Amino acid sequence: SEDEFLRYLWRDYLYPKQYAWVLIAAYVAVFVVALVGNTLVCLAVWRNHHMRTVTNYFLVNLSLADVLATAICLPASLLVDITESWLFGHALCKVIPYLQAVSVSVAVLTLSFIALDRWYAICHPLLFKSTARRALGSILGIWAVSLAIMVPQAAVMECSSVRAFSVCDERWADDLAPKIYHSCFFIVTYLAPLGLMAMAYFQIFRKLWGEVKQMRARRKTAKMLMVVVLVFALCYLPISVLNVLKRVFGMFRQASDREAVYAAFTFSHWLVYANSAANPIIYNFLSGKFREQFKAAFSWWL
Numbered sequence: 001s002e003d004e005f006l007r008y009l010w011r012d013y014l015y016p017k018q019y020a021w022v023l024i025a026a027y028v029a030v031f032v033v034a035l036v037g038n039t040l041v042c043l044a045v046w047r048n049h050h051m052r053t054v055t056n057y058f059l060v061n062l063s064l065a066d067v068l069a070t071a072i073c074l075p076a077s078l079l080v081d082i083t084e085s086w087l088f089g090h091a092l093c094k095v096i097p098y099l100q101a102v103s104v105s106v107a108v109l110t111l112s113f114i115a116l117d118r119w120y121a122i123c124h125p126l127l128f129k130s131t132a133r134r135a136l137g138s139i140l141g142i143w144a145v146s147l148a149i150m151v152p153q154a155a156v157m158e159c160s161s162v163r164a165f166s167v168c169d170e171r172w173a174d175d176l177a178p179k180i181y182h183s184c185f186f187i188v189t190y191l192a193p194l195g196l197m198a199m200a201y202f203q204i205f206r207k208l209w210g211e212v213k214q215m216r217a218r219r220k221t222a223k224m225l226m227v228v229v230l231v232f233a234l235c236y237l238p239i240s241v242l243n244v245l246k247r248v249f250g251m252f253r254q255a256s257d258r259e260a261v262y263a264a265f266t267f268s269h270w271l272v273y274a275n276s277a278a279n280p281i282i283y284n285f286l287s288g289k290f291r292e293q294f295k296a297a298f299s300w301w302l
């Protein structure tokens with residue numbers, strides 16, 4: 001029974017090995033590309049004074065939130081996605097999930113303020129002054145808000161023993177509280193800002209593609225930014241939806257195909273980190289100015 005042997009070889013050995021190879025290579029490729037890429041974003045804006053715009057100051061802040069998640073949270077997520085257990089202790093069970101939620105909040109708030117800045121500059125000019133100095137005040141305000149509103153997330157994280165292994169999970173005293181919290185989390189960090197940004201960029205699209213030199217520069221930046229928002233919305237959609245289906249709709253509680261649930265959650269966690277790697281790649285192709293600084297970086301160190 002050679003066919004039956006090959007089927008158990010595939011199930012018990014070949015498939016789990018290929019799965020671990022794909023998983024580890026995917027997480028390592030994204031960790032490296034995100035660390036290098038986002039460092040280069042910060043260096044491109046620091047080196048060239050002409051790219052020291054309000055948009056690019058917020059793009060640097062997006063890179064900081066993306067570096068926060070890549071450096072601290074990505075290695076922890078990789079180990080949970082391998083073991084399905086917590087190996088970093090009780091203290092880090094509160095800190096790493098908290099820093100991850102802070103990073104999402106900083107990322108989406110940074111995107112909202114870029115949209116807001118572009119919407120006032122293009123659709124409703126001369127009502128609100130937007131300068132580089134005021135961008136640093138708005139950036140500090142983004143961190144202060146994000147650090148505060150994510151404390152409930154830190155408060156619910158618990159590291160509990162289950163063999164003798166630990167699990168880092170949210171502890172809720174009653175069934176109603178996680179439903180209200182995960183509904184609010186989804187609408188505040190995903191749905192409401194992305195719905196508002198889509199409507200703002202649709203208005204900017206109508207104004208720009210409906211002075212000539214300025215509109216040529218504005219069309220290039222608005223095209224890039226629309227691609228960034230679209231890619232953020234696609235990357236954060238599977239995790240945002242899985243968290244609602246789990247916490248609000250009580251899904252994935254049956255263990256019949258536990259491995260299928262782990263794979264959907266793993267791929268969803270990886271898409272969040274893939275976003276940090278994606279943003280500097282988007283600036284490379286949709287910004288000639290970021291393209292120059294990146295081309296100069298590969299000419300120098302490589």
Ligand SMILES: COc1c(F)cccc1C(=O)N1C[C@@H](C)CC[C@H]1CNc1ccc(Br)cn1
Nearest residue numbers: 073076077096097100101153185239243269272
């Ligand atoms: C974007 O969300 C996550 C991620 F990208 C990696 C791992 C987990 C998540 C996640 O589902 N959440 C829940 C959400 C309501 C707040 C943000 C995180 C917090 N939980 C975490 C985060 C990191 C690690 Br590692 C373990 N748990």
Ligand SMILES: CCCCCCCCS[C@@H]1O[C@H](CO)[C@@H](O)[C@H](O)[C@H]1O
Nearest residue numbers: 071075086087088089090091092093
């Ligand atoms: C950049 C330097 C690398 C640091 C990586 C952090 C990993 C933490 S190990 C972790 O420490 C806990 C105490 O905090 C113990 O409870 C755990 O048993 C142990 O596994």
Ligand SMILES: CCCCCCCCS[C@@H]1O[C@H](CO)[C@@H](O)[C@H](O)[C@H]1O
Nearest residue numbers: 091094095098147148151154155156
């Ligand atoms: C920048 C604002 C400062 C707040 C940062 C929150 C993360 C601290 S870790 C964690 O927070 C939980 C919630 O408060 C407590 O239950 C724990 O005892 C404590 O270890």
Ligand SMILES: CCCCCCCCS[C@@H]1O[C@H](CO)[C@@H](O)[C@H](O)[C@H]1O
Nearest residue numbers: 155156157170171172173174177178
């Ligand atoms: C509108 C008012 C909003 C406040 C609601 C507070 C309800 C408490 S939930 C409770 O919080 C603890 C924090 O320490 C966790 O340890 C528990 O696991 C979790 O169940």
Ligand SMILES: CCCCCCCCS[C@@H]1O[C@H](CO)[C@@H](O)[C@H](O)[C@H]1O
Nearest residue numbers: 174175176177179180181183184248
């Ligand atoms: C704005 C926030 C709204 C989010 C959606 C949550 C709706 C709760 S359904 C509700 O859950 C209770 C606790 O689990 C049960 O006692 C009830 O039988 C059931 O009807």
Ligand SMILES: CCCCCCCCS[C@@H]1O[C@H](CO)[C@@H](O)[C@H](O)[C@H]1O
Nearest residue numbers: 173174175176177178179180248249
């Ligand atoms: C702290 C108090 C906790 C109470 C939790 C109950 C929440 C109400 S859910 C609501 O209950 C209705 C009953 O009239 C049903 O008709 C609806 O279908 C259902 O959605």
Ligand code: NA
Nearest residue numbers: 066107275276
């Ligand atoms: Na991000």
